[PDB]
Amino acid sequence: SGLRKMAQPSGVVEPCIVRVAYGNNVLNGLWLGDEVICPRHVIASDTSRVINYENELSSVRLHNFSIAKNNVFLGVVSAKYKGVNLVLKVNQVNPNTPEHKFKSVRPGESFNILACYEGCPGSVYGVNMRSQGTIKGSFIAGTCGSVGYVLENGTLYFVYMHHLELGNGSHVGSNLEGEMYGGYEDQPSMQLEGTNVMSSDNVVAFLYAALINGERWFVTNTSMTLESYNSWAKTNSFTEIVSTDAFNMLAAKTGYSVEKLLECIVRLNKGFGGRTILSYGSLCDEFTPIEVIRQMYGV
Amino acid sequence: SGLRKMAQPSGVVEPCIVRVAYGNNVLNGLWLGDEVICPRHVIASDTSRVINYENELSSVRLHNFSIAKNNVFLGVVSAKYKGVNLVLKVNQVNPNTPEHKFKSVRPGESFNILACYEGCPGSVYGVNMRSQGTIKGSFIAGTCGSVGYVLENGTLYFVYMHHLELGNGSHVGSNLEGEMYGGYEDQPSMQLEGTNVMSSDNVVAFLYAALINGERWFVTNTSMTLESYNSWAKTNSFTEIVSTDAFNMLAAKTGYSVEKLLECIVRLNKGFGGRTILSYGSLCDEFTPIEVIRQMYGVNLQ
Ligand SMILES: *[C@@H](O)[C@H](C[C@@H]1CCNC1=O)NC(=O)[C@H](CC(C)C)NC(=O)OCc1ccccc1
Ligand SMILES: *[C@@H](O)[C@H](C[C@@H]1CCNC1=O)NC(=O)[C@H](CC(C)C)NC(=O)OCc1ccccc1
């Protein structure tokens, strides 16, 4: 038993990380085949300043890139943008390129961050995409280019690359197509996040986790229809529930329908009365249904 | 800029995990060289009752082990107990054996758990050893043999192997010499966890982390001596502070002495009661000062 926020093992990703420096900027790249992908602000001459990305590209000196994986030195052959990323062709194919694909994560979905410090993998932890396209992680100077990934059905997907932090502390990256999650710009000027909407799917998963862990104090055989829950959700900053299917296994094992747990949400959102659930003091939307299934049942 | 409980990368460990099956039991082994280490209850006929490990080992037949990882089949050459672990010699050397050492972790120290499910590494997460030898993780059937490790100054240390779960949900394992942390037995009979003692050093580190993150509702310009704080800590289940040297740089960057945070600890222990710190609802002792420094400043990564 027990519930902890987890990362999928990082081993297949770690050999793809390279250090990328240009000028005084130093961040991380993803080396696959003969291509390195990194955040394009590595070529900005002053990141404290609105960047004319287009003059920075047209005046780039390819030899002023410094790219290395331990004592493998990579030279840049060509450089272009793909959205908010630089796509650099390099002079050597990564011999440890794993089979992989690209996709985007959606709000509510969890994924893994390999946090890299100026080219060196340092830590790995799980996160969850919020409704405004941000994650709450732990990033500082030198960590841009840190990559997010997921392992599904035996295949590796790259889903995230880190670019910046908002004034409220939220963290903002792109997919590997160069599209910034949430639509934010890769510029130093002020950028605000809209209201956060809690993932109802994830909070249901959380309460199922609590029931599986033997913690049932909050639950009741009273239930609420999807429709009533969804009318309440819209006026309480919770997502609407589109279908119960993702919960079929949790409901089968526990014997609790989704609809009884929807009644729990509406009630518990008014407060826990100084009790806890899985040691949290308020509803937690950080665990997806599959995250719970993996941890509680091992599949 | 955020604080999250983190693990160091797992790549050097993943290739060392194998499935170990005997009878109806399935768990994980640590394959290094031509040696597999795994919890000895893999061989037990019935883990729901107390076990005579010495007698069961005498009836074991080495061809009844199945040890495997993907396209690797390992046959067992010999077996013996070292503490609560089986040490098996197998017929092939692990070609991806990392350089490594064994050591023990102590209370308040952090390390990494690679959770492994019937031979498949499934997840990695950081933990912190509690005063009674336990960790608060997530472990289920099939995850015994899961390994704990720490990377310090370029050296991979193996520090933990998983064995069991106490009645209160606390998780218990051994070091890699087969000594169980906290002295619990590898038996199904109920054993109690003593009282938990919070690590004061880690709580101070957590409060420093909050301050760096711009969260300071809880702090004042009032302090408490070490001797006063240690007197309190003895009677409120907190460790005593031996010295403030580990916090010099943290103290220099925030402007707050350890002694100010000590007063915060005594005050905040009665309750946050409605506010939060770095989204936590009560004092948290799961981060060491070095863990904090890594995340705030990105240096001492081992
Ligand atoms: C990596 O290049 C860096 C990651 C930031 C640094 C602090 N926490 C992060 O996630 N990205 C930036 O510095 C980014 C630069 C481009 C958007 C031009 N700027 C940024 O994030 O400014 C906000 C900020 C900077 C430094 C500390 C706290 C917030
Ligand atoms: C690994 O084989 C397994 C891991 C336990 C099982 C549940 N959570 C864990 O950490 N270890 C055992 O099953 C162990 C058997 C030996 C000590 C003989 N028994 C155990 O931990 O009993 C307590 C328990 C069993 C099942 C569910 C919850 C607690």
Residue numbers in the entry:
A (entry chain B): 1 to 299
B (entry chain A): 1 to 302
Q: Paper's wording?
A:
Coronaviruses take over the host's transcriptional machinery by encoding two overlapping polyproteins, pp1a and pp1ab, which are cleaved by coronavirus-encoded proteases—papain-like protease (PLpro) and main protease (Mpro, also called 3CLpro) —forming 16 nonstructural proteins (nsps) that are essential for viral replication. Mpro, a cysteine protease, cleaves the polyproteins at 11 conserved sites containing the Leu-Gln↓(Ser, Ala, Gly) sequence, releasing the nsps required for the viral replicase complex. Since Mpro cleavage is required for subsequent viral replication and transcription, Mpro is an attractive target for drug development against coronaviruses. GC376, a dipeptidyl aldehyde bisulfite adduct, is a prodrug that converts into the active-form aldehyde, GC373, upon administration, effectively binding the active site of Mpro and stopping viral replication.
Here, we present crystal structures of FIPV Mpro-GC373/GC376 complexes, revealing the inhibitors covalently bound to Cys144 in the active site, similar to SARS-CoV-2 Mpro. GC376 being the dipeptidyl aldehyde bisulfite adduct form of the drug converts into the active-form aldehyde GC373, thus making both structures identical. In both structures, FIPV Mpro crystallized as a dimer, with each protomer being comprised of three domains, similar to other viral Mpro. Weak H-bonding was observed between the oxyanion of the inhibitor and His41, the general base in the catalytic dyad, which is distinct from SARS-CoV-2. For the P1 position of the inhibitor, the Nγ of the lactam ring sits in the S1 pocket and forms a H-bond with the carbonyl oxygen of Phe139, a conserved feature in other Mpro structures with GC373. The S2 pocket that supports hydrophobic interactions of a Leu moiety is formed with His41, Ile51, and Leu164. In FIPV Mpro, Ser1 of the N-terminal finger from protomer B forms a weak H-bond (3.8 Å) with the cyclic glutamine analog nitrogen of GC373 in the active site of protomer A, however, this is not seen in SARS-CoV-2 Mpro. While structures of SARS-CoV-2 Mpro co-crystallized with GC376 solved by other groups have shown the drug binding in both R and S hemithioacetal isomer conformations, here we only see the R conformation of the drug bound to FIPV Mpro.
